[PDB]
C-alpha cells in the first residue's frame, strides 16, 4: 500500500494487517478471529548514494483464520492463543471461543471438543472438571446438566456422586427427600437415609 | 437369572449375524450359547447389560457391538458413525445379489452438478430405506463426504457448516492444500477464491466471473464493486461422477 504522494515504491503491510486490493490508500487491519504475519515482509530501504529504493517484500494479502482450538479476541494481532481451559473452539476463525455447554467439561488447553461428564457428576456452563454431585442427589445419566434430589422414601446409592436411587427396603422408611446411604455402619441407612 | 451378555426367551433364541459383513447379504443365523448356563448369547449389534433379561437391547445410535455377547457396546471412534453397512455400501448404487438388491444401500444422496450441463437435485432419488442407526452390528462405517464426527459417541454425523467443506478422501480432494489430510473429524474452510453456502458439501464452489472471494471460508461470494471487474474463463463448479 501507499498513502504519501509521489512515492518511488509502495510500502509492505505490517504484520497484523493486509492489503486485499490493488492501490490501497491505507492498509486494513485484521478483524478479530484472524491474524496475519509475514516475517519476510520488508519495506524498501533507500540507497543514500543513489536515492534508489530496494528491498521491498510484499506483505500479507489475505487474513489467516485461526485454526480449530484457537481463538483471537483482539484485532491488530499477529497470532492467536489456545482457548482457555474450560472452553473450546470447534470452528475456524473464532472471535471468542464458546464455553462448554452444561453437562460437558474440558480439562485441557487448545481443545476443540468438550468431553461429556461421567455418571454421577454434573456441570454447568464452562467447567474445569465435572463436579461430583453432592450428597443426597443423583445423576444417573452421563452428561447431566444438574443432579436431582432423591425422592422421599428413596436413598442415593453412594454418599457422594450417586449414580442411582433405590427404594427403602422392607421394614425401613425414608421420611425426607434427598436421603443417601453411608458406607459407615449399615449400608442401608444414612444420616437422613432409610 | 441368565448371566449378562445372554438372554433366554421361549418364543425365539439364537443369534442373527450381521448381514453387511457377508457377500451374500443374507444374515447368517447362529446358536452360540453360554456354556455353564445355556442361555443364548446376545446377537451382534445388541448388548445384554443386566442379569437375566428376556430380550437384547439394541445399541444406541453412535455405538456399536460386533461380538455375540457384549454386556455393553463401545462408542464409535471420532470420524466414524453408526450406519448400516460400511462407507462403500451406503455410498453404492450397483447391485450384486439380484435377489435382495444387495449392497445397493442408496443412503447417500447429494444435490449438485452432474455429467452434462444439467443440474440434478438430488443426484440419487427414491424412497430412502436403509437409514437405521441403532443396530451397528459391524465395525463403524467411515463418515460420508460432507460430514464429520469430532467427538466419539456422536449419534449422527454432523454436516459441515456453510463456508467449510469435507471431501471424500485426500487423494480425491480436488481443491485442498498439500499439507492437509482428511480423516472424518475435520471441516476445512473453502479455499480463497471459492465459496460454499450449503451444509454438507464435498467440494467448494468456484466463484463466478464478475465476483470474487478474498477471504478463506466465505459463506457467500462478494460482488465486484463498480470500477472493478473479474473474469476467469477456467473457473467452473465441480461436476459429480454419477
Ligand atoms: C513501512 O514503513 C511505514 C513507514 O513509512 C509503515 O507505516 C506505518 O506502520 C506502523 C506499523 O509499523 C503503523 O502503525 C502505521 O499506521 C503505518 N502508517 C500508515 C500511514 O499506515 C509501515 O508499517 C511499514 N511496513 C512494515 C512492514 O514495517
Ligand atoms: C457454482 O455454483 C454456484 C451455485 O449455483 C453459482 O453461484 C450462482 O451464480 C449465479 C450467476 O451465475 C448467481 O446469480 C447466483 O446468485 C449464484 N448462487 C449462489 C447461491 O451464490 C456459481 O456461478 C457457480 N460457479 C461457476 C463458475 O459457474
Numbering used by the authors:
A (entry chain B): 1601 to 1794
B (entry chain A): 1407 to 1648
Publication excerpt:
Here, we report the structure of the native C. reinhardtii mastigoneme to ~3.0 Å resolution. Our structure of the C. reinhardtii mastigoneme filament demonstrates that it consists of multiple copies of MST1 around a central single copy of MST3. The structure reveals that MST1 copolymerizes with a second HRGP, MST3, that likely tethers mastigonemes to the membrane through a PKD-like domain. Both proteins exhibit poly(proline) regions that form linear PPII helices, with all proline residues having been converted to O-glycosylated hydroxyprolines.
We traced each mastigoneme filament in cryoSPARC24 and extracted particles along their length with an arbitrary step size. A multi-step processing procedure revealed helical symmetry with a rise of approximately 380 Å and a twist of 172°, creating a filament that is 12 nm at its widest and 6 nm at its thinnest. By exploiting D1 symmetry and using masked local refinement,25 we were able to improve the resolution of the mastigoneme to between 3.0 and 3.1 Å. Residues 43–1,175, which are predicted to be rich in β-strands, form nine consecutive immunoglobulin (Ig)-like domains (D1–D9). Residues 1,176–1,853, rich in cysteine residues, form a single 26-nm domain belonging to the growth factor receptor cysteine-rich domain family with 26 disulfide bonds. The fundamental repeat unit within each strand is an antiparallel homodimer formed through an extensive interaction between central cysteine-rich domains. Based on the appearance of the electron cryomicroscopy (cryo-EM) density, all proline residues within the PPII helix are glycosylated. The most likely interpretation is that each serine is O-glycosylated with a single galactose moiety, which is a plant- and algal-specific post-translational modification found on members of the HRGP family. Our analysis revealed unassigned density occupying the central shaft that strongly resembles, and can be partially modeled by, a glycosylated PPII helix.
